[PDB]
Design a protein around this ligand. Structure first.
Ligand SMILES: *[C@@H]1O[C@H](CO)[C@@H](O[C@@H]2O[C@H](CO)[C@@H](O[C@@H]3O[C@H](CO)[C@@H](O)[C@H](O[C@H]4O[C@H](CO)[C@@H](O)[C@H](O)[C@@H]4O)[C@@H]3O)[C@H](O)[C@H]2NC(C)=O)[C@H](O)[C@H]1NC(C)=O
Ligand SMILES: *[C@@H]1O[C@H](CO)[C@@H](O[C@@H]2O[C@H](CO)[C@@H](O)[C@H](O)[C@H]2NC(C)=O)[C@H](O)[C@H]1NC(C)=O
Lengths: 111, 52, 52, 127
């Protein structure tokens, strides 16, 4: 389907700031502020990391952040550690009471 | 979030009507502020106390 | 409706004349209950009429 | 704390029908929607649909019209998903998620924020 286009993979060293983009048409993410980023380790169920791209969840550290501009959202991670080695997905609201998930990526830690 | 249909009857004239409904069914509603309404009611009451 | 059910609307079907002066086809539309009235004293719940 | 559990495992013949049960505890079952998602091995997870346990209304995405039916039991507070016409590519995992709050004044079905998940259930079609 015409899901959200997303890159393949990224990398970064510990203590470095790295951002990952996720974009879609105006109807998917442009006309609405409903976006969410999900972290998924192998085997275990995914866990969400942000509400509406801006409001942080309870019990989640301040290392992660996210911001939307135009027709693309960006998830930024500051102070990389070994706990960030997992898959990241972007999902949003597609209109007519539907939810669409992105392709997803994998994050690697140098060293 | 209703949507419109297009039924054509007679020469060059159409009648519109509601067709399908997309999205969860909810109820229309109206909203007023409580404190402001109560203050206005009390003001009107004290103004009416002069006549009664 | 596909998403559920609504109590304030009824799915009424009736025959309407097409662009041809004498030719009828079936059509459907959703109508609000206050605009719907039982037709006659005969208690046939499948028949209704507009309030007109 | 809030807990969600599902069945252990299920195996069925190709073209057959399967059923999955997901149960919740720690919160009122009639106060929130329930989203169902499917994840293929090593591929992007797909969203199937959502179900409202109050009136029984459900909605599904395209490519699944009439092939999947979702219902619930309010007395025991469980959600059942039935699928039919299985295909060889249906070997995947299924998860149930807790979505937004039922307000009865403003729509909240489309909000994609769901936090509490379960261990899921694995389905395979060897054939
Ligand atoms: C309230 O109701 C209105 C009326 O129903 C509703 O408007 C609808 O919005 C949806 C958007 O989700 C429209 O669907 C799209 O229509 C365009 C044509 O204009 C299609 O090209 C789209 O399909 C393509 O893109 C999709 C996503 O990019 C892909 O998934 C798909 O495979 C195609 O590539 C898509 O169908 C719909 O057309 C309108 N309705 C009308 C009558 O045009 C509105 O969204 C509702 N609002 C709420 C909050 O419920
Ligand atoms: C209201 O009832 C009418 C029938 O009286 C429905 O129209 C039919 O719907 C079925 C299933 O979608 C179609 O196979 C028929 O072709 C339709 N008939 C006509 C004349 O178009 C209508 O869908 C019902 N309303 C809603 C909201 O479902």
């Amino acid at each position: 389907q015409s899901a959200l286009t997303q890159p393949a993979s990224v990398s970064g060293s510990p203590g470095q700031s790295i951002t990952i983009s996720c974009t879609g048409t105006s109807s998917d993410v442009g006309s609405y502020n409903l976006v969410s980023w999900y972290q998924q380790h192998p085997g275990k169920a995914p866990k969400l990391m942000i509400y509406e791209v801006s409001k942080r969840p309870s019990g989640v550290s301040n290392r992660f952040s996210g911001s939307k501009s135009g027709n693309t959202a960006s998830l930024t991670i500051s102070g990389l550690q070994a706990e960030d080695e997992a898959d990241y997905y972007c999902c949003s609201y597609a209109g007519s009471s539907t939810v669409i998930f992105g392709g997803g990526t994998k994050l690697t830690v140098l060293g | 979030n209703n949507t419109r249909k297009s039924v054509r009857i007679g020469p060059g004239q159409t009648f519109y009507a509601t067709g399908d409904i997309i999205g969860d069914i909810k109820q229309a509603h109206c909203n007023i502020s409580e404190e402001k309404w109560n203050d206005t009611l009390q003001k009107v009451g004290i103004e009416l106390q002069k006549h009664f | 409706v596909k998403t559920g059910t609504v109590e304030e609307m009824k799915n009424c079907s009736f025959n309407t004349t097409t662009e041809i002066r004498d030719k009828e086809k079936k059509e459907y539309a959703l109508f609000y209950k206050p605009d719907i009235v039982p037709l006659s004293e005969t208690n046939n719940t499948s028949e209704y009429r507009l309030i007109n | 704390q809030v807990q969600l559990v599902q069945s252990g495992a299920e195996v069925k013949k190709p073209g057959a029908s399967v059923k999955v049960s997901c149960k919740a505890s720690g919160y009122t079952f009639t106060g929130y929607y329930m989203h169902w998602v499917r994840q293929a091995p090593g591929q992007g997870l797909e969203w199937m649909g959502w179900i409202n346990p109050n009136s029984g209304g459900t909605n599904y995405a395209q490519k699944f019209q009439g092939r999947v039916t979702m219902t619930r039991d309010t007395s025991i507070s469980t959600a059942y998903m039935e699928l039919s016409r299985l295909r060889s590519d249906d070997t995947a995992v299924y998860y149930c998620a807790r979505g937004g709050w039922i307000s009865l004044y403003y729509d909240s079905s489309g909000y994609p924020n769901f936090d509490y998940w379960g261990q899921g259930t694995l389905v395979t079609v060897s054939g």
